Design a protein around this motif. Structure first.
Motif, PDB file in Angstrom:
ATOM      1  N   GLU D  62      -1.495 -17.780 -34.542  1.00  0.00           N
ATOM      2  CA  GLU D  62      -1.253 -16.352 -33.840  1.00  0.00           C
ATOM      3  C   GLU D  62      -2.463 -15.681 -33.285  1.00  0.00           C
ATOM      4  O   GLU D  62      -3.363 -15.701 -33.648  1.00  0.00           O
ATOM      5  CB  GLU D  62      -0.812 -15.476 -34.229  1.00  0.00           C
ATOM      6  N   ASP D  63      -2.617 -14.811 -31.695  1.00  0.00           N
ATOM      7  CA  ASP D  63      -3.310 -13.891 -31.743  1.00  0.00           C
ATOM      8  C   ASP D  63      -3.978 -12.725 -32.536  1.00  0.00           C
ATOM      9  O   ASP D  63      -2.463 -11.684 -31.782  1.00  0.00           O
ATOM     10  CB  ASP D  63      -3.363 -14.760 -29.773  1.00  0.00           C
ATOM     11  N   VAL D  64      -4.954 -12.641 -32.410  1.00  0.00           N
ATOM     12  CA  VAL D  64      -4.804 -11.606 -33.560  1.00  0.00           C
ATOM     13  C   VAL D  64      -5.824  -9.910 -32.597  1.00  0.00           C
ATOM     14  O   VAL D  64      -6.550 -10.918 -31.800  1.00  0.00           O
ATOM     15  CB  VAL D  64      -4.879 -11.393 -34.760  1.00  0.00           C
ATOM     16  N   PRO D  65      -5.457  -9.114 -32.636  1.00  0.00           N
ATOM     17  CA  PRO D  65      -6.375  -8.387 -31.290  1.00  0.00           C
ATOM     18  C   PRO D  65      -7.219  -7.226 -31.933  1.00  0.00           C
ATOM     19  O   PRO D  65      -7.275  -6.970 -33.413  1.00  0.00           O
ATOM     20  CB  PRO D  65      -5.175  -7.360 -30.936  1.00  0.00           C
ATOM     21  N   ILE D  66      -8.558  -7.422 -30.818  1.00  0.00           N
ATOM     22  CA  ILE D  66      -9.492  -6.641 -31.451  1.00  0.00           C
ATOM     23  C   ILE D  66      -9.252  -5.210 -31.426  1.00  0.00           C
ATOM     24  O   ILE D  66      -8.779  -5.015 -31.528  1.00  0.00           O
ATOM     25  CB  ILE D  66     -10.746  -6.624 -30.219  1.00  0.00           C
ATOM     26  N   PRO D  67      -9.896  -5.020 -33.190  1.00  0.00           N
ATOM     27  CA  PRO D  67      -9.742  -3.320 -32.503  1.00  0.00           C
ATOM     28  C   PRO D  67     -10.709  -2.374 -31.410  1.00  0.00           C
ATOM     29  O   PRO D  67     -11.398  -1.957 -32.682  1.00  0.00           O
ATOM     30  CB  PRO D  67     -10.541  -3.111 -34.470  1.00  0.00           C
ATOM     31  N   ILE D  68     -10.285  -2.087 -30.929  1.00  0.00           N
ATOM     32  CA  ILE D  68     -10.582  -1.382 -29.417  1.00  0.00           C
ATOM     33  C   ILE D  68     -10.641  -0.251 -29.967  1.00  0.00           C
ATOM     34  O   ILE D  68      -9.742   0.460 -31.067  1.00  0.00           O
ATOM     35  CB  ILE D  68     -10.032  -1.698 -28.597  1.00  0.00           C
ATOM     36  N   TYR D  69     -11.682   0.766 -30.207  1.00  0.00           N
ATOM     37  CA  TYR D  69     -12.164   2.397 -30.440  1.00  0.00           C
ATOM     38  C   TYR D  69     -11.803   2.833 -28.253  1.00  0.00           C
ATOM     39  O   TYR D  69     -12.429   2.753 -27.796  1.00  0.00           O
ATOM     40  CB  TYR D  69     -12.828   2.671 -30.739  1.00  0.00           C
TER      41      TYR D  69
END
Ligand SMILES: Nc1ccn([C@@H]2O[C@H](COP(=O)(O)O)[C@@H](O)[C@H]2O)c(=O)n1
Ligand SMILES: [Mg+2]
Ligand SMILES: [Mg+2]
Ligand SMILES: [Mg+2]
Ligand SMILES: [Mg+2]
Ligand SMILES: [Mg+2]
Ligand SMILES: [Mg+2]
Ligand SMILES: [Mg+2]
Ligand SMILES: [Mg+2]
Ligand SMILES: [Mg+2]
Ligand SMILES: [Mg+2]
Ligand SMILES: [Mg+2]
Ligand SMILES: [Mg+2]
Ligand SMILES: [Mg+2]
Ligand SMILES: [Mg+2]
Ligand SMILES: [Mg+2]
Ligand SMILES: [Mg+2]
Ligand SMILES: [Mg+2]
Ligand SMILES: [Mg+2]
Ligand SMILES: [Mg+2]
Ligand SMILES: [Mg+2]
Ligand SMILES: [Mg+2]
Ligand SMILES: [Mg+2]
Ligand SMILES: [Mg+2]
Ligand SMILES: [Mg+2]
Ligand SMILES: [Mg+2]
Ligand SMILES: [Mg+2]
Ligand SMILES: [Mg+2]
Ligand SMILES: [Mg+2]
Ligand SMILES: [Mg+2]
Ligand SMILES: [Mg+2]
Ligand SMILES: [Mg+2]
Ligand SMILES: [Mg+2]
Ligand SMILES: [Mg+2]
Ligand SMILES: [Mg+2]
Ligand SMILES: [Mg+2]
Ligand SMILES: [Mg+2]
Lengths: 46, 95, 217, 243
Positions: D62-69
């Motif tokens: 699975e590809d987990v997303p970066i927590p973008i701000y």
RNA sequence: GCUAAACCUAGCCCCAAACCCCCACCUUACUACCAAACCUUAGCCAAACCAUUUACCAAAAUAAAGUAUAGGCGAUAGAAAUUGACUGGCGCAAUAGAUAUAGUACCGCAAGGGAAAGAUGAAAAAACCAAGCAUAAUAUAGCAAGGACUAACCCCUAUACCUUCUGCAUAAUGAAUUAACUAGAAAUAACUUUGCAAGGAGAGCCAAAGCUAAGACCCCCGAAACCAGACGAGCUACCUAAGAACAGCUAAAAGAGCACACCCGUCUAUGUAGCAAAAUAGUGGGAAGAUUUAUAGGUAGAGGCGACAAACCUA
RNA sequence: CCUCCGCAUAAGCCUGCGUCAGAUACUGACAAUUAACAGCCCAAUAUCUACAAUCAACCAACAAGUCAUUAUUACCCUCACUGUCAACCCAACACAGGCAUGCUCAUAAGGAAAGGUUAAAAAAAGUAAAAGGAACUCGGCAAAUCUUACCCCGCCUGUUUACCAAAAACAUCACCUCUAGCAUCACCAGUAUUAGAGGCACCGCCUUGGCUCCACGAGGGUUCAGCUGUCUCUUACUUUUAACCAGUGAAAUUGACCUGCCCGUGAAGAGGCGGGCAUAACACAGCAAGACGAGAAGACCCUAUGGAGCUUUAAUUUAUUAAUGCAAACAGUAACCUGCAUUAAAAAUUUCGGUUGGGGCGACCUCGGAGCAGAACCCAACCUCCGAGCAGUACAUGCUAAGACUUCACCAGUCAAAGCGAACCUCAAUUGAUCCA
């Protein structure tokens, strides 16, 4: 010298420093009031 | 060694033990000799063969590794073509 | 802190403005500059620094009459109250302008270098070469920021096709445009640097306290 | 004691019981939908399984997303799903070294855009990713009408969307008359994204605006009971005259 | 025979079920009436130091499985695919159960800390014993007793207890005494006892007599710290704003002389659970200034502030 | 007979010695501070105000200063609200302390040092003292009478460790050096005669200065003179304390005590143990030799893979700032923001081995031969002595495998028949694990 009495009262300093208006001005003071309210305090401020 | 995990409440294996030792089902653990592939130019041929052997472990070493692994590693495994399937059981061991 | 800067005034008033001391402190309330605090209480005289500022709906070169040369507590020179037309204002007084002299403010660039007295002000085209000037501005119209302290005089060394070279009193050279206005002569309160301060009391009246821990590091 | 409902479900309970219940259906559908964005700062695995190295066995990936701000300036402009990456980094690309804070920001431009549907030149703070997405969308109008709510990721971008969508849904005299054939060309070019006005008015709002819009709809200054009771009495007297 | 001692229900705890809440009051709150929210937790802690790393907290049964996997490849960390998910009490009973009779009284400038306790009964329109004493002070000699004895003492024996120590009567620690409260929490494998037995087990597991079930085994108090978020400059340091005080004599605008008021604190003496968590009494230094001082405001914690004393920032 | 007291306002308290009733300034009830004093203000738009104060008059400055309205527009409705007590506030207390301003200069106001005795000691304070006059002492500290000079340091007046240090330290005029050519939230509404930073110490003469050099100091020493109870050498009285009577009434402390001396002994300094000797029982007052007296889990010393600093030429980092470079985003013609590198600054994290006849200094830290350890094995040392971190020869210096030894554990180390394949190892230690790479 004799060092008992650091408390030199004045109601202007008391109200300006620890009052309800000042508590409610800061967002951290609003949380101070909210904490006294949750604790159940009969007096939330000066 | 983590007797009780924070996640499951279960007991954990030391994967250092699983990397180094082999548990035969009878309770014997088999290791390599510490130093068996270094400085072989300066070791003598008999010492080199002594280093090349697979050896057994001591009783207290066996009990420590028994403790440091879980019981997944102590079950009876019936792999296809196994060089240790004859060694997994004790024969004529009187006392 | 609750630091509104005291300099909120908009209209150029001639009267002194009540000047608030700072203690060398930011708007944040903390010390920024060390060694400041507790002078004699002073008042700020609003100096017009644009020497050629013709008054409302008027023309070019005009005349002013000096009324009063006066000590200014907020700087090192002397301030001349001068009057011309229907308005009056403070300027920094060059040396040897008494009460009664007449000074000339001209923007005219005469081809010949004008034979002018010590008090008046012209652009450097009208000033001759090698000439003692004090109130010098970099761009034309901004107003003078350079030599205007007590007893300082920067020289005009040469005139170039569109610019000029000023020796600033730090033995410095500065390129200025030809058209900007500058006052001739050296500034008043000469002998000022040969005033011994005397007492630590006199320093503390000037408004400079002894301050330690000058490196908040 | 225990709460009857879990605390992650408290918000849905509000959305079911309040004036939030009297919000229209499609709006609450979007609010509950809340899907996943497009990869911007991470590279997606193209596959669901992968034979991982060091043992030739297929493990699921699975590809987990970066927590973008995203800052409020982003919402004032348009960044194309692109924001700040607030993370840690290892000192010399070597884990046996210091670990140390890092903030990766995008590059920001002040570009001027024409929207054919609103007929206005907007100056906004875009980035190269918006510019490229506009180029692959073949225009700002198409980009804003095609891009999803969270891939667009701007309060301003969704204001632009519902302005454009309301423009289409009402077929307004958008430039002025004497060019109704050109207006027909515009609305025919973007005729595909046509939705009812009762939906386009609610496209793109925040929940605070939606509740405010809803209570403005249902203010309804009270009816005098003199009017109510005289209506009842007139009805009763007409019934008596009938009987 | 005083002081006491005794008591039982006020309530509370854990579950289940069920989703819950007239006036005045953001100005100095509780005052009738005027021109701005949104940004990775860190660190203590484990690694017997610590520097990558170090559980969970940020909704997810049982098993797969503590497996694949990660990792100073070490301490440790760790999946997924797949898979069977109507009210009660071997709870407390007033030092317990809630902190609660109450977030009150009291303490603190503030944030904040934070108690104690009541028992006649159906109707009150009705008995005895802790310690400490007293009734009743004592009679050579000695760990306070013991062996005894006709008999209390006289005779003989006889270095308190705990803890820590190689060794304590020790002149090593602790302890007036009484009542109450106050300190051993669990797995891997064994062993013992049943059940069934080449199988066991109410699947996902083990099994070359095994498997299942039970029984047995892992304390309490105590730093200096560290980090986060608040609260503090009514004391004190410095500053800002608008105020005030400074006798007399000498002198004639000087950080002037002597000296009051005031400010300070040189020497001594008293004091030391004090009058006082820094005072008193005499002696002294400055006393028109770089002075003292009232009122309001500002600077806040690795920060402020400092005429540097590691000084001060509420003993 | 006493008093820098008293009265008032301010600030702070918030009914806290008014009346009555009750119980043993406490409790309850009932009353009360009345606005003229004081507070709670100002309709604005534009604009006007260079001139000190100080008896303000000559006259004197420098540090350069607080008091101020006009043209017009709208505005007559009028006096509300609140403070007003006290023996009071801040110090846990009815606290010898803290406490601003006006006025009274000993009070016209306010107060009471002694509960009652006695008249011991020790203690506190005072006064007097023959002869002598610093012989006291670290020192004339304290008292008594007033004074002189010399040095040391610091130029001065100032500041400092609230609560053991008031100084030679800090600051300060003076001088030097370094940085800065400029505008609007500090420096600054400033501009090189300016601003910021550091250092030395005034001054006359001369170029890390040096020699003079005046005034000042609760600084540090020294001398003379006087004066004196400091002393030879103490005494007398008075006041407090004291002791006793009356009322009220603590605290540290305490294993239990039926709690003697001597000599010996003993965890090495005994009331309690051995041997002697003494020895009816209880107060009260003194005293200070002992109870290794009390106080406060020794601050000195050591220890801890305890904590915190402090500095760096210790390790690791530049995430943040800076100044470069490279791209990225503009203008072109035949600057600012973002990403990646670098060198600096500020930092930020972290640590600072062991044995040791205390710790430090010095030396050592692994392995082997000899002696202590004489005849199986073993056997310590900051014990006595000697050595090694390889070197040769070929490269069977192959491969396997019974059985043993083992440095007192494990890890490691050592020997080895037979068998297959073959030519036909020397060695005193002669070395190093795991993971990584
Ligand atoms: N096989 C090896 C040997 C050394 N090294 C590197 O060389 C270094 C040598 O250590 P110092 O130079 O003593 C190691 O710390 C490691 O960084 C390596 O990467 N791989
Ligand atoms: Mg640790
Ligand atoms: Mg309770
Ligand atoms: Mg309680
Ligand atoms: Mg009894
Ligand atoms: Mg001992
Ligand atoms: Mg001890
Ligand atoms: Mg004791
Ligand atoms: Mg007991
Ligand atoms: Mg203050
Ligand atoms: Mg003086
Ligand atoms: Mg002294
Ligand atoms: Mg100071
Ligand atoms: Mg110092
Ligand atoms: Mg020091
Ligand atoms: Mg007190
Ligand atoms: Mg009287
Ligand atoms: Mg008496
Ligand atoms: Mg005599
Ligand atoms: Mg002598
Ligand atoms: Mg002598
Ligand atoms: Mg004296
Ligand atoms: Mg001095
Ligand atoms: Mg002191
Ligand atoms: Mg002081
Ligand atoms: Mg002192
Ligand atoms: Mg002095
Ligand atoms: Mg008595
Ligand atoms: Mg003895
Ligand atoms: Mg004894
Ligand atoms: Mg003692
Ligand atoms: Mg100790
Ligand atoms: Mg250790
Ligand atoms: Mg630590
Ligand atoms: Mg710290
Ligand atoms: Mg050591
Ligand atoms: Mg062995």
């Amino acid at each position: 010298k004799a060092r008992g009495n650091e408390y030199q009262p004045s109601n202007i300093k008391r109200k300006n420093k620890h009052g309800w208006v000042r508590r409610l001005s800061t967002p951290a003071g609003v949380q101070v009031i909210l904490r006294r309210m949750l604790k159940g305090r009969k007096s939330l401020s000066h | 060694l983590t007797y009780f995990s924070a996640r499951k409440g279960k007991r954990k294996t030391v994967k250092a033990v699983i990397d180094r030792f082999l548990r035969l089902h009878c309770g014997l653990w088999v290791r390599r000799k510490a130093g068996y592939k270094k400085k072989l130019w300066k070791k003598t041929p008999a010492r080199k063969k002594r280093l090349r052997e697979f050896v057994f472990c001591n009783k207290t070493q066996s009990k420590l590794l028994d403790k440091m692994t879980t019981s997944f590693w102590k079950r009876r495994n019936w792999y296809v073509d196994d060089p240790y399937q004859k060694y997994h059981d004790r024969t004529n061991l009187k006392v | 802190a609750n630091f509104v800067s005291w300099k909120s005034r908009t209209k150029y008033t001639i009267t002194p403005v009540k000047m608030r001391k700072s203690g060398g402190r930011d708007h944040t309330g903390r010390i920024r500059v060390h060694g400041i605090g507790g002078g004699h209480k002073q008042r700020y005289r609003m100096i017009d620094f644009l020497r050629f500022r013709p008054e409302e709906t008027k023309s070019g070169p005009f005349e002013e009459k000096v009324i009063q040369v006066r000590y200014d507590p907020c700087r090192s020179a002397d301030i001349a109250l001068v009057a011309g037309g229907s308005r009056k204002r403070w300027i920094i007084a060059t040396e040897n302008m008494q009460a009664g002299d007449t000074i000339l403010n001209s923007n005219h660039i005469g081809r010949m270098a004008v034979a002018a007295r010590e008090g008046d002000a012209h652009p450097l085209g009208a000033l001759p070469v090698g000439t003692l000037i004090n109130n010098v501005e970099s761009e034309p119209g901004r107003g003078a920021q350079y030599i205007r302290a007590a007893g300082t005089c920067g020289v005009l060394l040469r005139k170039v096709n569109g610019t000029a070279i000023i020796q600033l009193p730090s033995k410095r050279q500065m390129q200025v445009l030809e058209t900007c206005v500058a006052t001739v002569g050296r500034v008043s309160n000469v002998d000022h640097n040969k005033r011994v301060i005397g007492k630590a009391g006199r320093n503390r009246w000037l408004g400079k306290r002894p301050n330690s821990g000058r490196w908040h590091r | 004691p225990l709460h009857k409902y879990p605390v992650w479900l408290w918000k849905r309970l509000q959305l079911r019981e309040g004036i939030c219940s009297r919000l229209p259906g499609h709006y609450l559908r979007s609010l509950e939908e809340e899907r996943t964005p497009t990869p911007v700062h991470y590279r997606p695995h193209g596959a669901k399984f992968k034979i991982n190295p060091k043992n030739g066995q297929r493990e699921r990936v699975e590809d987990v997303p970066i927590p973008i701000y995203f800052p409020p300036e982003s919402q004032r402009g348009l960044w194309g799903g692109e924001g700040w990456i607030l993370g840690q980094i290892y000192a010399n690309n070597d884990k046996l070294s210091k670990r140390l804070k890092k903030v990766w920001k995008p590059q920001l431009f002040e570009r001027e855009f024409y929207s054919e549907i609103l007929d206005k030149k907007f100056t906004v703070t875009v980035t190269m990713r918006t510019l490229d997405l506009i180029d692959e969308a073949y225009g700002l109008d198409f980009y804003i009408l095609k891009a999803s709510g969270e891939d667009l990721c701007s309060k301003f971008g969704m204001d632009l969307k519902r302005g454009m969508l309301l423009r289409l849904a009402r077929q307004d005299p958008q430039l002025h008359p004497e060019d109704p054939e050109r207006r027909a060309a515009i609305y025919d070019k973007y005729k595909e994204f046509a939705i009812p006005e009762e939906e386009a008015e609610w496209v793109g709002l925040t929940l605070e605006e939606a509740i405010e819009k809803q209570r403005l709809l249902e203010e309804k200054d009270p009816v005098p009971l003199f009017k109510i009771y005289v209506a009842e009495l007139i009805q009763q007297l007409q019934q008596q005259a009938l009987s």
